[PDB]
Amino acid sequence: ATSTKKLHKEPATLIKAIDGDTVKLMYKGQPMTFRLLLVDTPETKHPKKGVEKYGPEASAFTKKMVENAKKIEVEFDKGQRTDKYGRGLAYIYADGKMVNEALVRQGLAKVAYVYKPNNTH
């Protein structure tokens, strides 16, 4: 698992897949709109190409992977589980297939740069 500590993953219920990143899941009875950690798909930092988001395919693409899945898992990183906007930050696995991987590997998303300056700075 790369790390010695295996991060906390828990199953969730799929409510809807809005974007190709931003989706709504219900974990332990908590419905939250999640977005996929290390992924940046729907709203671009600043759409430079314009069609730099690929929203139509991306949002459909997530639906494909999540709706065909029997088991949907939300795994949280060492960053945060939740963000102030009331949106969750997770990696979504469909029976162990990380949807986040599929997005970037398909070129539908970019990895969201979580910033490490050097150490403390």
């Binding site: 991060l7 060492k78 986040n100 590997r105 398909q106 070129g107 990895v111 910033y115 300056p117």
Partner: protein, 35 residues
Amino acid sequence: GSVAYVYKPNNTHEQLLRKSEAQAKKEKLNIWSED
């Protein structure tokens, strides 16, 4: 650099995502064909 800032060392999963990213970048897949 990057004009971005985060303090937490989130590296966990970055390598997983970025191998998959690298594959697609070189393949000029969709967004990676922006270049």
